[PDB]
Amino acid sequence: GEVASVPLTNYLDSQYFGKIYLGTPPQEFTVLFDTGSSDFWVPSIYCKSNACKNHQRFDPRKSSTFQNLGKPLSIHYGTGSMQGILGYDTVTVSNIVDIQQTVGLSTQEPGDVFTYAEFDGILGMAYPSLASEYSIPVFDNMMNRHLVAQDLFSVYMDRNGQESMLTLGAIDPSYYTGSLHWVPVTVQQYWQFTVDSVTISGVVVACEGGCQAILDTGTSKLVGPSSDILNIQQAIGATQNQYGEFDIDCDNLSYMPTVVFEINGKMYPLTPSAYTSQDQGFCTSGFQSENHSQKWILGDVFIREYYSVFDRANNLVGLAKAI
Amino acid sequence: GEVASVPLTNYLDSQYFGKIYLGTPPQEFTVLFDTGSSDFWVPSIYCKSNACKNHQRFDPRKSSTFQNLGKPLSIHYGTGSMQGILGYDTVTVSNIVDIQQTVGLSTQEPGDVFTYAEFDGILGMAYPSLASEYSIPVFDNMMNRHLVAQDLFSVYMDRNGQESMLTLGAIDPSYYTGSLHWVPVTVQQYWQFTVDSVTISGVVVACEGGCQAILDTGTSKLVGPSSDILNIQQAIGATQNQYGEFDIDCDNLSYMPTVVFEINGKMYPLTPSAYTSQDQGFCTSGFQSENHSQKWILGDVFIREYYSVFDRANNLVGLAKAI
Ligand SMILES: [Cl-]
Ligand SMILES: [Cl-]
Ligand SMILES: [Cl-]
Ligand SMILES: [Cl-]
Ligand SMILES: [Cl-]
Ligand SMILES: [Cl-]
Ligand SMILES: [Cl-]
Ligand SMILES: [Cl-]
Ligand SMILES: [Cl-]
Ligand SMILES: [Cl-]
Ligand SMILES: [Cl-]
Ligand SMILES: [Cl-]
Ligand SMILES: [Cl-]
Ligand SMILES: [Cl-]
Ligand SMILES: [Cl-]
């Protein structure tokens, strides 16, 4: 029954990541705390890929508490893949000591997807139904052993600065204004819920009649079905460039529409500033299309605007305007 | 992972009750399945009170699986009290076999409160925080040992007939029309939630600005704070008689107001037929005052109109219009 404050870092267009420790004595890693997945893995000495060469690698030879399970682990992240082997060791996340935790030790991380990522590994924070075979999600172990004060965690992403924070077991009202609104999880695998509509000036531009969405800290953009995202890219004045990216004129923010997500009867507006990312003298749309799905992904673009609480005890998502 | 269908019976103005079995071999009892409490008890051979004389008494001498814990149990029901001693035995509720279940064996049930009650004992179905010391709620044992298919139960009360039903582990859409609406539990002790307002023709007559309420199968009436209930007794044309009861003219139902509870943005109307009980050539108000509380109790008057699902996995109450 403890609380862990995990400061999150991000560089430019990178994901948000933070520190955990693994083994006895503790070995340090940066991980993507990822509400879009449920497995926990880090690079290991058994991985020779370029990506592993560029990241911290777990050395089980130096841990008195490591135990190999031998079971394969395979995951996808972006267009890349990781292959590894599951074992047990002790994970420490500030206050919290999570012994005998299943963890993948990578063996293969081919390609450049993981090489230039800022994090070493991924710590999934979604439901066990999303976990790979033989894998037990870290937060589930924490809950089942009553290691956390409450069975929830909170994520604050600093739109402007470096005060981002993941809190295990508590909610910090200092990171938001107004009150938290609670949204029922519809399908317990991702952190999934119903979006009622997406509007501009009261006109429905997407999600007509309702759609499913997930709240995903491990995705940067706001992802939706082709035809809906088209409506939005046109409305915000985004246009495709050679890289396939949708660019927005940074100096036009003042003239662009506010895109409002209605979730469980409450409004979650995204201003042009919010949905436009400025990674240079170039601004890009924070909206992105998917072709083989109608399920929305509310990634960091959304979370930066709305402090997010993930409540396993009640199967709710809490949203409040981020400070 | 099973389902139990427990038929519920009621006679005239009695509570609703159903059958469970206790001991090895099984001994039969009728119990009040009571979402307003969390303890489980039945009369025993060690109780000589009149009330025990008029009810089935558990004989541990005949059960090979009984174990006395010796710990006292004390409960209140209506204006009466039960004193007993906790032990373990096996409870059977149709499909479901719940071994080593804490159960109070009564020793003292003085006064007439329990004597003329139809049930032998009480099986509380609220949260563990409401349970007496050393007592483990039956449904919590069922959930913790994965004895039920889903961690919820559903209650249908037949306003007109004898088709009432308690279902452990499932929801039966045949008992309701339209769809279930889910209401968040605010305080996990009783099945408690927020009522937004109580209105007649759109005018707020009670619960101005919101109030707390519980959904309680072990209470007959709809209970609220003095001043609010006054507004309602006056509006429905109820008047006090010598017995302190509020009587309603049965032939005036057609002229009386509909009293609407707004809960989580949805309307739950109670027609004059619904809130008027006809236990003879006399009709009485289903509303009742309480003086030392502002927390409403939505008892059988409400549940008869709205099929009720109690969901422990999600800490929700589900409501739908009863058939
Ligand atoms: Cl990254
Ligand atoms: Cl799950
Ligand atoms: Cl909790
Ligand atoms: Cl907290
Ligand atoms: Cl809601
Ligand atoms: Cl939908
Ligand atoms: Cl589409
Ligand atoms: Cl703006
Ligand atoms: Cl009774
Ligand atoms: Cl509790
Ligand atoms: Cl369940
Ligand atoms: Cl069901
Ligand atoms: Cl209130
Ligand atoms: Cl009052
Ligand atoms: Cl009527």
Author numbering:
A (entry chain A), B (entry chain A): 1 to 323
What did the publication describing this PDB structure actually write?
Natural bovine chymosin is found in two isoforms, A and B, which differ at residue 244, which is an Asp in the A form and a Gly in the B form. It is the B form that is used in the investigations described in this paper, as it is commercially available in large quantities at high purity; it is referred to as ‘bovine chymosin’. Based on X-ray synchrotron-radiation data, the structure of bovine chymosin has been redetermined to 1.8 Å resolution. The structure of bovine chymosin does not differ from the three structures determined previously and can be superimposed with the earlier structures with an r.m.s.d. of 0.39 ± 0.02 Å (comparing 1733 atoms on average). In both the present structure of bovine chymosin and those determined by Gilliland et al., Strop et al., Newman et al. and Groves et al., the N-terminus is visible and forms one of the strands in an antiparallel β-sheet as in other aspartic peptidases such as porcine pepsin. In bovine chymosin the β-strand is formed by residues 4–6, with Ala4 and Val6 forming hydrogen bonds to Leu168 and Leu166, respectively. A prominent secondary structure in bovine chymosin is the central six-stranded antiparallel β-­sheet at the ‘bottom’ of the active site, which links and stabilizes the relative orientation of the two domains in the structure. The N-terminus of bovine chymosin forms one of the strands in this sheet. The engagement of residues 4–6 in the β-sheet in bovine chymosin keeps the N-terminal loop in a conformation in which it forms part of the binding cleft; in camel chymosin the same residues point towards the active site. The chloride ions in bovine chymosin and the sulfate ions in camel chymosin are located adjacent to these patches, demonstrating the impact of the positively charged patches of the structures. Previous studies of bovine chymosin have identified a positively charged patch on the N-terminal domain and a negatively charged patch on the C-terminal domain adjacent to the substrate-binding cleft; these patches were suggested to influence the interaction with κ-casein.
Bovine and camel chymosin are aspartic peptidases that are used industrially in cheese production. They cleave the Phe105-Met106 bond of the milk protein κ-casein, releasing its predominantly negatively charged C-terminus, which leads to the separation of the milk into curds and whey. Despite having 85% sequence identity, camel chymosin shows a 70% higher milk-clotting activity than bovine chymosin towards bovine milk. The substrate-binding cleft and active site are located at the interface of the two domains.
